Design a protein around this nucleic acid. Structure first.
Ligand SMILES: *O[C@H]1[C@H](O)[C@@H](N)[C@@H](O[C@H]2[C@H](O[C@@H]3O[C@H](CO)[C@@H](O[C@H]4O[C@@H](CN)[C@@H](O)[C@H](O)[C@H]4N)[C@H]3O)[C@@H](O)[C@H](N)C[C@@H]2N)O[C@@H]1CO
Ligand SMILES: [Mg+2]
Ligand SMILES: [Mg+2]
Ligand SMILES: [Mg+2]
Ligand SMILES: [Mg+2]
Ligand SMILES: [Mg+2]
Lengths: 103, 225, 65, 137
RNA sequence: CAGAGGUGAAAUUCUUAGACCGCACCAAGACGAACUACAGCGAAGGCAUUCUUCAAGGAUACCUUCCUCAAUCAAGAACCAAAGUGUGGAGAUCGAAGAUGAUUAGAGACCAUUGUAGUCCACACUGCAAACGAUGACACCCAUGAAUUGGGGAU
RNA sequence: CUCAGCACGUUUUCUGUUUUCACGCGAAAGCUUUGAGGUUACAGUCUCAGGGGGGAGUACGUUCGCAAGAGUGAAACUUAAAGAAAUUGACGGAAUGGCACCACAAGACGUGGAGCGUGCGGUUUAAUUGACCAACACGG
RNA sequence: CGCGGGGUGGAGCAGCCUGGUAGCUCGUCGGGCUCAUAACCCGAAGAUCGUCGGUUCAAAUCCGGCCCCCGCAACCA
RNA sequence: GCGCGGAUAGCUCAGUCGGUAGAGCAGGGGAUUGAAAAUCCCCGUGUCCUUGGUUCGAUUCCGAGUCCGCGCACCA
RNA sequence: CACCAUGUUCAA
């Protein structure tokens, strides 16, 4: 039973032979780069309660000059993406939905 | 007590900058076999370029500049440009996904003797009416974006001195004149000199250093309170 | 200990549901530095909004949700 | 009583605080802006007795208050902040102690200059700890 | 200057002969992040910085040349991931074996600290993959709508 | 100026990697100009392998290899199913949304300790005449 | 045989006040948790210190004779 | 027999230089908890090896001596 | 992300 056409990974049949693996973001498991689920997070450094304390005590930072943030590009193992609930198991008809941009 | 043996010293930039005296520091008093003036004369001082030229606009806010100590005049640390670098928060926000990213490295030997790398990064953009999914680039054209940048920095910064070259790297005179000439090769979303480093230096001339500071702003910490 | 007023009850938290997540306004004396400051804190016991309570260390905020 | 430099009462003297939060222990380290001179280094494992609390944000907060106590003695009115995770080949996401350390310097009246994350990012990586199958839990 | 590390909690381990941290630098060996994707190249293994080079490869364009030269294949040839082997280098990091912690009823395992062979290069050998699209090669016919890569042609 | 340039827009067309979509096909899952279609209405060409599950990719023989091994490759004996795809259910130290004082929470009042009453087991005895959350002051 | 070592709760081992129902790990019991067993938790029991004498206020210890077990040696013509 | 160190509850150990003992840890209780290990809070507990000179007052000062370490000695 | 091993033979 082929659970999914493309077999879990972005490689088609006659395109690549292999893709060199990356380590998982927390597991450290080596999975191929096209297989491993990849999220680019734009996480702020401070919570909006905590950022308001720091922006008030800052000569630089205010409503005019915004505070920096973290830009890190996480890539996870498939065991690692389910367990951190980055990704979840979806119904059989619902598995083909593909999101091309961050919602 | 450890602050009982510390003397406050003041760090002066060269004459290019508006706020000359930045980043007050400490150092030990001289014991006698080791002098403070030799321990200080290799230190590197990182300062934001918006905290120096005193005219922001979120192009200077995202570059810090490093200065290395040449001469010690009492409480002043007479410095020279060590490196400049676009900060890590601005640089990671410039990458989008579906475009392409060219990274050039050019080795420049100035007319003073300073050898430097400049690490230019560039990014393609889509056009206004463009319906395509990606707008990548031909690798013939990214090698001529790279060839023209490498040719144009080795020509403009090999005539100049080092005070002039830092004034080219600051104020975006070099970068704006490098976007405009490299935009008819490929559509460029952003061309930004990412970091520049002084790699090798000429042998230390004292009169060439004092000329690079104009008038030293005369620190106030060989003092009574 | 500063006396803060519950202006919002954010729902029952914890595993067993005995702890309540509130949003407490600090109610200082209006010339103070930390006046009209609001904190998101965990309350143990039955708490409705507009219920004053004493706070030992007001500089902590609880992790929401 | 104050080993500060020669200025008025109003002037801001800057140092650079180096907040390093791991998931094991958080550091708060104040230097001179060259790094070559250290004013105070207070770590979160000096505030708590158990090793599991050393990474916690409350131990980062108490370590942040011990810094402000000495930085006033040294005459440091304001700070630039360089935050970092462990980086390199490791997890690159900042720990629990990071945002609570920074909030406790602003809450204690230390003026905050320019926030920057200087976590070590490789252009290409050495091989990371753990096997091909990674850490298994 | 008084602890760092590590964990689910720890303990092996490092540390007032100064660890961890912070700054600039140096050395050595690997590796080329983000960009990096249902993208390209290659017969398959496989291939990801740059610049100067060497011989090639396919596609496309063509009112060039050739004129059946082809298809597929026992036998026979040359390639073939990783581990492995031989001889020299290298030896940074990860690390089969092994050693210490711990968990456990036991733990010869997972987890932590290490650490040999190996990892990396040169020249030989091997020819064992979930070597996969679990789909032999070459032709033919075959409805539809988004896209995408390279070449060419119209505006 | 790698500049009679670069990218785009609308449209043609060849080559490549694909995608959600008509027949048809299949035991189904699924495949579908990229066939698993054009097949009992069964023949375009060539080629390799399979013949119930094992034993067994074993033994012997031989050829390669420095060795590890590799290629080739049985039988005696043994078995009545092994498999394949789907359905319905039950289960998960798998997600997700609910619920219950025969669950917890926050508490109350106790049982388990003691003495007795009574039921159950055992041991005795001529005999000490069902049930083991949903048996044990219950068969009134 | 000379010489040297030990006999200890059912098992394996300790034992420096000359002396704690003598101590340890395991086992045996009785109750819990479990649908049940194991693990786990709460408890309780069990010693002729091989044996006979003797030193002593008091002996597993201290001195003995015995019974066992286990070795070291057992030589050069 | 010469100099250095060690003796402080069962175990472990820093001392105020001559004004009264401390933490570490084990032993009995509540807390965590549904049940753990770890974590917490609470009640044991050392005449401070023997002697003196006994400084207002000796774990602390000082003079011998037993005990234990190292590095040194060496003619009945 | 502490630990969490197992349930005799046919038959209904
Ligand atoms: O070779 C092509 C063939 O001739 C033709 N039948 C075509 O089929 C489609 C066509 O599909 C492609 O749409 C692509 C654009 O999204 C386009 O590709 C082309 O893009 C242009 C811009 N870059 C060209 O410059 C480029 O060379 C070219 N590859 C088409 O190929 C549709 O656009 C039509 N609407 C319908 C046709 N049936 O596709 C063949 C290759 O795919
Ligand atoms: Mg492969
Ligand atoms: Mg474990
Ligand atoms: Mg290691
Ligand atoms: Mg009865
Ligand atoms: Mg069994």
């Amino acid at each position: 039973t082929t659970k999914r056409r493309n077999h879990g990974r972005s490689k088609p049949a006659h395109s690549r032979g292999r893709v060199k693996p990356i380590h998982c973001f927390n597991c450290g498991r080596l999975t191929p780069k096209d297989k491993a689920v990849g999220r680019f997070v734009v996480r702020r450094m401070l919570d909006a309660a905590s950022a308001r304390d720091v922006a008030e005590a800052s000569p630089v930072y205010g409503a005019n000059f915004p505070m920096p943030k973290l830009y890190m590009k996480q890539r996870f193992c498939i065991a690692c993406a389910i367990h951190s609930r980055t990704v979840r198991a979806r119904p059989v008809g619902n598995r083909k939905i593909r999101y091309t941009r961050k919602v | 007590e450890t602050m009982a043996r510390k003397e406050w010293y003041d760090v002066v930039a060269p004459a290019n900058f508006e706020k000359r005296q930045f980043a007050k520091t400490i150092c030990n008093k001289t014991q006698g076999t080791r002098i403070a003036a030799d321990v200080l004369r290799g230190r590197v001082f990182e300062a934001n370029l918006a905290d120096l030229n005193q005219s922001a606009g979120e192009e200077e806010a995202y570059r810090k500049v490093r200065f290395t100590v040449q001469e010690v005049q009492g409480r002043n640390l007479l410095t020279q440009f060590h490196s400049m670098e676009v900060t890590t928060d601005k640089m990671a926000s410039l990458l989008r996904k579906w475009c392409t990213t060219m990274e050039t490295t050019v080795e420049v030997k100035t007319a003073d003797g300073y050898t430097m790398r400049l690490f230019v990064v560039a990014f393609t953009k889509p056009q206004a009416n463009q319906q395509s999914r990606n707008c990548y680039a031909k690798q013939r054209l990214v090698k001529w974006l790279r060839m023209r940048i490498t040719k144009m920095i080795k020509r403009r910064l090999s005539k100049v001195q080092i005070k002039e070259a830092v004034s080219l790297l600051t104020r975006n005179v070099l970068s704006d004149a490098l976007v405009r000439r490299c935009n008819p090769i490929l559509p460029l979303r952003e061309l930004r000199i990412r970091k520049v480093r002084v790699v090798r230096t000429p042998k230390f001339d004292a009169q060439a250093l004092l000329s690079a500071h104009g008038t030293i702003p005369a620190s106030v910490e060989a003092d009574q309170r | 200990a500063q006396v803060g007023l519950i202006i919002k009850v954010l729902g029952r938290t914890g595993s067993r549901g005995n702890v309540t997540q509130v949003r407490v306004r600090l109610m200082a004396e209006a010339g103070s530095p930390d006046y009209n400051r609001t904190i998101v804190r965990n309350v143990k016991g039955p708490c409705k909004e507009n219920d004053m309570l004493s706070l030992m260390e007001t500089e902590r905020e609880a992790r929401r949700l | 009583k104050a080993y500060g430099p020669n200025v008025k009462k109003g002037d801001l003297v800057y140092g650079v605080v180096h907040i390093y939060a791991s998931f094991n222990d958080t550091f708060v380290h104040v230097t001179d802006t060259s790094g070559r001179e250290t004013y105070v280094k207070v770590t979160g494992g000096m505030k708590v007795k158990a090793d599991r609390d050393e990474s916690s944000p409350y131990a980062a907060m108490m370590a942040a208050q011990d810094v402000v106590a000495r930085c006033k003695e040294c005459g440091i009115n304001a700070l630039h902040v360089k935050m970092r995770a462990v980086g390199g080949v490791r997890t690159k996401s900042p720990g629990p102690g990071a945002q609570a350390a920074l909030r406790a310097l602003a809450r204690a009246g230390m003026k905050i200059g320019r926030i920057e994350d200087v976590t070590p990012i490789p252009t290409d990586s050495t091989r990371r700890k753990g096997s091909r199958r990674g850490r298994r839990l």
